[PDB]
């Protein structure tokens, strides 16, 4: 009864689900450190590795025209819609190979890169937050006032925008049509991303409006380079500044949830496919 290709497929599919469990846990944290992006990249690489071997094995079953019985073909209807699954054995095995490989490249890994790009932006922004305390010192004439290095902070925020002006949420490489970019814009979030023309194509860039709002807020504080704020004007500025930071924290959390939920849809496919192999 055993067939080497089906044996390895079942083992490979099982390893994907095991990696999926570890990735769900990593995305279930509350703060993605730089070790977090390293762990994600590890799991994503292991998924791709096993997905690519599964495709090779399914490809063998296709070219050798191994039969898929009527039972195994019914289990496949349980596949999630995102997988896009009376045709021949050869054709169906091939469509399964395409399905599992394409849902990884065109769906799961799209959310992964969107998380990685935005995470890096927020980590670089957190590096600016670490330096904020040193840009705030007592006002010379009033112990309840503060002096803020507006230009120093402004400089860092402008360079943060430059550092990510060419690192889009989607796609990781090349460009896409305007229509395709707008599909993933409305999917990821219109306030999290922004469609931009790269060079005749289009990408979904990181929406840096919160940084822009911070910068417009700084400009409205008054000129000179340094500014002195009474306790009230400082609490008002810092309140808006902290709100923008929490907006970015929320945006990241939104992308992590979409990535995590996409991994579950991916996991559902693997679960269905494994049941199909157990009946072939």
């Amino acid at each position: 009864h055993p067939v080497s290709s089906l044996t390895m497929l079942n083992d490979t599919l099982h390893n994907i689900r095991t990696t999926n469990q570890a990735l769900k846990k990593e995305l279930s944290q509350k703060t993605l450190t730089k070790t977090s992006l390293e762990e994600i990249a590890l799991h994503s690489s292991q998924i791709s590795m096993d997905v690519n071997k599964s495709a090779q094995l399914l490809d063998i079953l296709s070219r050798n025209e191994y039969p898929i019985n009527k039972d195994a073909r019914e289990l496949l209807h349980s596949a999630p819609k995102e997988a896009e699954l009376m045709i021949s054995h050869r054709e169906l095995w091939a469509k399964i190979a395409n399905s599992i490989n394409d849902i990884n490249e065109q769906y799961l890994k799209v959310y992964e890169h969107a998380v990685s790009s935005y995470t890096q932006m927020y980590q670089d922004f957190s590096a600016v937050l670490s330096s904020l305390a040193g840009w705030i010192s007592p006002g010379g004439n009033d112990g309840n006032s503060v002096k803020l290095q507006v230009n120093s902070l402004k400089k860092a925020l402008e360079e943060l925008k430059e550092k990510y002006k060419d690192k889009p949420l989607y796609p990781a490489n090349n460009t896409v049509s305007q229509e395709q970019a707008n599909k993933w814009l409305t999917e990821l979030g219109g306030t999290i991303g922004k469609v931009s023309q790269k060079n005749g194509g289009y990408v979904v860039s990181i929406n840096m409006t919160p940084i822009d709002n911070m910068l417009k807020s700084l400009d409205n504080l008054g000129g000179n380079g340094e500014v002195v704020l009474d306790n009230a004007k400082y609490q008002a500025w810092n309140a808006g500044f902290s709100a923008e930071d929490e907006t970015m924290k929320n945006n990241l959390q939104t992308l992590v949830q979409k990535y995590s939920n996409a991994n579950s849809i991916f996991d559902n496919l693997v679960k269905v496919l494994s049941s199909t192999i157990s009946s072939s």
Binding site: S48, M49, N52, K53, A55, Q56, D59, S62, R63, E84, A94, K95, A97, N98, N101, D102, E105, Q106, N173, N174, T175, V176, S177
Partner: protein, 119 residues
């Protein structure tokens, strides 16, 4: 508006596998021979695989015979390149291409997808 979107390249270990995808739109898919080419750094662009009838195995170039295979899905207007037993020599910029016979002979290329094989 002919378009050829490619997906699925990247890094791979020697001996590993990859399945590149080429999704086509803007022309009558039945009047098009679909090809995969590749170009290593400093070398010339060379053919990899070529398929028209989705029911067969198409044609595979010599440097990848017995390792690469190609398939076609006429319902989705796609062709896939199953790259097995990868070698560092396979490192190149892979790009799909359509040869369209329609009164004139026209051919279109995609943006390409990088494939790097290394430990």
């Amino acid at each position: 508006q002919v378009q050829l979107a490619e997906t699925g390249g990247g890094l791979a270990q020697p001996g590993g596998s990859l399945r590149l995808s080429c999704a086509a739109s803007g022309f009558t898919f039945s009047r098009a021979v679909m090809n995969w080419y590749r170009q290593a750094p400093g070398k010339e662009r060379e053919l990899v695989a070529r398929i028209y009838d989705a029911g067969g195995n198409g044609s595979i170039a010599d440097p990848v015979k017995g390792r690469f295979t190609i398939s076609r899905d006429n319902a989705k207007n796609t062709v896939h390149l199953q790259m097995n037993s990868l070698k560092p020599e396979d490192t190149a910029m892979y790009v799909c291409n359509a040869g369209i016979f329609d009164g004139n002979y026209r051919t279109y290329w995609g943006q390409g997808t990088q494939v790097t094989v290394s430990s």
